[PDB]
């Protein structure tokens, strides 16, 4: 009488268009048969009692029944869809449930999609990497269930349902207040294999590692507030890149799409002088775009100055889905605002070159450009004026005759910064210096 992992249960969404692993346990050397939509595979478990087959790549569809057959009896897994599965991780703002979004009641009331599903990994930890989850089931996006979906993940999935027309499943693996070190395996930290959600490897071991044989289309991520500190904001860029590369290596896919949300604006109290840990962390996030198959949603226009938990999650999901459509689905569209590329300082002016990313630079509210500061060699930054000229912005200040650096939206709460494109996507904060 065989058993299956918690992910291969009633209502599951399985990753389409790549090999389909089915694994589980039984008696040692037990004979096992697995069938799915008229395909059958047999295998013998090993002396541990573990068994695994790979079923052919299957196109989007469903519902189907996954049958597993041993000599003791049969397991039937019902209402299985085949589509795209996305892993959704991070801390509070990915955990944030749909019911508590700005549109929560109305969005839950509109959530009537049997082909959009979530698997909520329970908050759990372990000092060692684990082969099994300790809980969780698949729920479809009905009004009875959708209130508990990740708000950002639901809205992201709702966008993909419309652009792909295939089933979407979200594996929700989140924990409010967590540090990235808790989500990283021992190796990415240089380690051997208090609040536990801030301790190295403890969440990865129980909430990520067991998921890794389950194929996914890509990952969406919203984390970093906890690491936006004097000590961890810059080194986050190396930790985050290492985390992505390791998750990817574990899954055997060095270009597995990995998308994240840059921190929103928040009066975090960390800014002092020209030091801004939150702006340093956002930079660490933007630098990670150097890795292949990555994208970033910028959201400094929709944070809450006075609450680290902004309730506008619909627009977060919209911008992650733009990026997913480019990075994971190979589509051409405006998925990013213009990106700063190059700076030249001649005269009393700085000219900044942007990659326009398929759009045009404009200004929220239509007035003068806000959010720029400029510094001389003394490294003191003054407010500056800025003018748009196609793919360039020219920046200057009456009080800086020999500028050497420019900073745009470089603070924890850059709620004035107003450079956008014609689709109203905001330009990411940035700086020209490495001070
Ligand atoms: Zn399991
Ligand atoms: Zn392992
Ligand atoms: Zn809050
Ligand atoms: Zn949208
Ligand atoms: Zn690209
Ligand atoms: Zn140019
Ligand atoms: Zn203001």
SS (H, E, C) 226-291: HHCCCCCCCCHHHHHHHHHHHHHHHCCCCCCCEEEECCCCCCCCCCECCECHHHHHHHHHHHHHHC
Q: Give CA–CA dist 28/45, Å, rounded.
A: 6
C-alpha of residue 42 to centroid of ligand 6, in Å: 60
User: How far is residue 136's CA from residue 152's CA, in Å, rounded to a whole number?
Assistant: 19
| Sheet of strand 349-355, all strands in order from the earlier edge strand to the far edge | 339-346, 349-355, 392-396, 385-389
How many residues are listed for the chain in this entry? 435
In what order do the strands lie in the sheet containing 381-383? 381-383, 372-375, 405-408, 430-431
**Partners of 15 in the β-ladder:** 83
Cα 296–300–306 angle (5° rounding)? 135
Is 301 found in the same domain as 165? yes
Determine whether 106 is exposed, middle or buried from the number of CB atoms within 10 Å of its CB (0-12, 13-18, 19+).
Answer: exposed
Position 93 in a domain: yes
Structure tokens, 314 = 């619909």
Quote the ligand 1 centre to 250 CA distance (angstroms).
17
Q: Which of 61, 80, 99 is the last residue of a domain?
A: 80
Q: How far apart are CA 274 and CA 381, in angstroms?
A: 8
Dist CA 309 CA 268 (whole Å): 12
Strands (E), 271-397: 294-297, 339-346, 349-355, 361-363, 372-375, 381-383, 385-389, 392-396
Q: Which ligand is nearest to the CA of 333?
A: 5
- CA atoms within a 13 Å half-sphere pointing along the CA-CB vector of 417: 29
Task: Among 327, 347, 366, identify where a domain stops.
Answer: 327
**Ligand 2 centroid, distance to 294 Cα (angstroms):** 24
Residues 165, 226 within the same domain: yes
The CA distance from 75 to 67, in Å, is: 6
Query: What distance in angstroms lies between residue 254's CA and the mean position of ligand 5's atoms?
Result: 15
- For residue 239, what are the contacts with CB-CB under 8 A and spacing of at least 6? 180, 181, 184, 188, 189, 227, 232
What's the Cα-to-Cα distance from 7 to each of 94, 250, 343, rounded to whole Å? 20, 18, 49
Whether residues 31 and 94 share a domain: the answer is no
- Name residues whose C-beta falls within 8 Å of residue 237's C-beta, 6 or more positions apart in sequence: 283, 284, 285, 287, 288
Task: Please report whether residue 208 resides in a domain.
Answer: yes
φ, ψ (nearest 5 deg) of residue 175: -155, 115
Residues 351, 382, single domain; the answer is yes
Cis preceding-peptide flag for 63 (omega within 30 of 0):
yes
The CATH number for 62's domain is 2.60.40
Which listed ligand is nearest to 353 at the C-alpha?
A: 6
- Other residues' Cβ atoms within 10 Å of the Cβ of residue 38: 6
Ligand closest in space to the Cα of 370: 7
Structure tokens at 335: 């998925």
| 344 Cα–ligand 7 center, Å | 29
Residue from 2, 21, 3 nearest 214 by CA: 21
Q: 373: CA distance to ligand 1 center in Å?
A: 52
Cα–ligand 5 centroid distance for 381 (angstroms)? 34
Same domain, 189 and 300: yes
Give the integer Cα–Cα distance in Å for 364 and 137.
43
Q: Are residues 100 and 187 in the same domain?
A: yes
Alpha helices in 6-127 (DSSP H): 92-95, 104-110
Query: Does 333 map to a domain?
Result: no
Buried residues in 393-408 as b, exposed as e (16+ CB within 10 A): bebbbeebeebbbbbb
Would you give the DSSP letter of residue 71?
S
Q: Is 159 left (phi over 0), alpha (psi -120 to 50) or beta?
A: alpha
3-state SS class at 70 = coil
Q: How far does the chain reach from its first CA to its final CA, in angstroms?
A: 63
The contacts of residue 59 (CB under 8 Å, 6+ apart) are 16, 17, 82
Is 2 among the domain residues? no
Q: Enumerate the β-bridge partners of residue 44.
A: 31
Q: How many Cβ atoms are within 10 Å of 297's Cβ, its own excluded?
A: 27
Contact (CB, 8 A) for 236 and 286: no
Tokens 């910028």 identify what position? 298
Number of alpha carbons in the 13 Å side-chain half-sphere of residue 180: 27
In a domain, 4, yes or no: no
Question: 175 lies in a domain?
Answer: yes
Structure tokens belonging to residue 91: 């801390």
CA distance 202 to 230: 23
Q: For residues 217 and 168, is the Cβ–Cβ distance under 8 A?
A: no
Note whether 250 and 205 are within 8 A (CB): no
CA of 209 to the centre of ligand 2 (A): 7
Ligand that lies nearest to the alpha carbon of residue 103, given by its number in the listed order: 4
Q: Are 148 and 104 in contact (CB under 8 A)?
A: no
Whole-number Å distance, alpha carbon 329 to ligand 5 midpoint, is: 10
* CA 109 to chain CA centroid, nearest Å: 25
Ligand positioned closest to the Cα atom of 95: 3
Last residue of a domain, one of 50, 80, 110: 80
CA atoms within 13 A on the CB side of 46: 7
In a domain, 141, yes or no: yes
Would you state the structure tokens that stand for residue 364, as one six-digit string? 């929220």
CA distance 25 to 68: 11
How far apart are the C-alpha atoms of 233 and 200, rounded to whole Å?
A: 17
Q: Are both 86 and 72 inside the same structural domain? A: no
Q: Give dist(CA 21, CA 54) in Å, integer.
A: 4
Is residue 295 domain-shared with residue 357, that is, in the same domain?
A: no
Domain of residue 381: give its range: 339-425
For Cα atoms 121, 123, 125, give the angle at the middle one, nearest 5 degrees: 110
The structure was resolved experimentally with X-ray
Please give the Cα distance from 148 to 280 (Å, whole number). Answer: 33
Q: Residue 150 in contact with residue 98, Cβ under 8 Å?
A: yes
- C-alpha 327 to ligand 5 mean position (Å): 6
Residue closest to 416 by CA, chosen among 406, 405, 427: 427
Cα(245)–Cα(255) distance, integer angstroms: 9
Same domain? 58 vs 103: no
Residue 162 CA, chain-centre distance (Å), reads: 19
How many domains does the chain fold into? 3
Say how far apart CA 192 and CA 152 lie, in whole Å.
34
Q: How do strand 74-90 and strand 13-15 relate by DSSP bridges?
A: parallel
What stretch of H or E contains 356? none
How far apart are the CA of 306 and the centre of ligand 3, in A? 8
Q: Are residues 44 and 138 in the same domain?
A: no
Is residue 5 included in any domain, yes or no?
no
Shared-domain flag, residues 294 and 305? yes
Q: Which ligand is nearest to the CA of 96?
A: 3
Given the DSSP bridges, would you call strands 339-346 and 39-44 parallel, antiparallel or unpaired? unpaired
- Whole-angstrom distance, CA of residue 121 vs CA of residue 36: 25
Tell which residue, 95, 150, 98, has the closest CA to residue 123: 95
* Radius of gyration of the chain, Cα coordinates, nearest whole angstrom: 24
> Contact at 8 Å (CB) between 384 and 400?
yes
- Residues in Cβ contact with 27 at an 8 Å cutoff, skipping those fewer than 6 apart: 45, 49, 70
Structure tokens at 9: 């249960």
Alpha-carbon separation of residue 104 from 86, 93, 96, 206, 290 (angstroms)? 22, 14, 11, 30, 35
Ligand 1 centroid distance, CA of 39 (Å): 24
CATH number of the domain to which 231 belongs: 3.40.50.1110
Ligand nearest to the CA of 344: 6
Whether 24 and 149 share a structural domain: no
DSSP 3-state assignment of 302?
A: coil
């Amino acid at each position: 009488v065989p058993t299956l992992p918690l992910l291969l249960a009633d209502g599951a969404v399985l990753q389409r268009d790549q090999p389909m692993p089915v694994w589980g346990w039984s008696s040692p050397n037990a004979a096992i048969a697995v069938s799915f939509d008229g395909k059958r595979a047999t295998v013998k478990a090993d002396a541990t009692g573990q068994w695994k087959v790979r079923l052919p790549a299957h196109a989007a569809g469903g519902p189907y029944v996954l049958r597993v057959q041993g000599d003791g009896g049969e397991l039937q897994v019902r209402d299985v869809l085949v589509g795209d599965v996305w892993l959704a991780g991070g801390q509070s703002n990915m955990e944030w449930p749909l019911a508590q979004a700005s549109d929560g009641p109305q969005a839950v009331a509109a959530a009537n999609d049997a082909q959009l599903r979530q698997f909520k990994v329970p908050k759990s930890w372990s000092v060692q990497p684990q082969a099994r989850l300790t809980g969780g089931e698949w729920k479809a996006a009905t009004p009875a269930n959708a209130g508990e979906f990740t708000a950002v993940g639901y809205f992201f999935a709702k966008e993909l349902r419309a652009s792909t027309g295939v089933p979407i499943g979200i594996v929700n693996s989140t924990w409010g207040g967590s540090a990235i070190e808790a989500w990283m395996d021992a190796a990415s930290l240089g380690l051997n294999a208090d609040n536990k959600n801030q301790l190295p490897t403890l969440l990865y071991n129980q909430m990520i590692h067991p998921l890794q044989p389950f194929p996914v289309k890509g990952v969406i991520w919203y984390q970093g507030e906890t690491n936006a500190t004097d000590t961890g904001a810059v080194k986050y860029r190396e930790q985050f890149a290492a985390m992505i590369r390791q998750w990817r290596a574990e899954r055997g896919d060095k270009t597995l799409p990995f998308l994240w949300v840059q921190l929103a604006n928040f009066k975090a109290g960390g800014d002092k002088g020209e030091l801004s840990p939150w702006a340093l962390l956002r930079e660490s996030q933007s630098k990670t775009l150097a890795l292949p198959a990555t994208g970033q949603a910028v959201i400094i226009d929709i944070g809450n100055p006075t609450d680290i938990h902004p309730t506008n999650k619909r627009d977060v999901g919209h911008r992650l889905a733009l990026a997913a459509r480019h990075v994971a689905y190979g589509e051409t569209l405006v998925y990013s605002a213009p990106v700063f590329k190059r700076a030249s300082f001649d005269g009393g002016k700085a000219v900044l070159g942007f990659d326009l990313q398929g759009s045009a630079l404009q200004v929220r509210g239509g007035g003068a450009v806000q959010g720029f500061r400029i510094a001389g060699a003394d490294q003191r930054f003054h407010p500056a004026t800025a003018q748009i000229d196609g793919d360039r912005v020219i920046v200057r200040s009456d009080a800086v005759a020999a500028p050497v650096a420019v900073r745009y939206g470089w603070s924890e709460n850059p709620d004035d910064a107003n450079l956008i494109n014609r689709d109203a996507l905001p330009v990411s904060p940035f700086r020209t210096d490495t001070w």
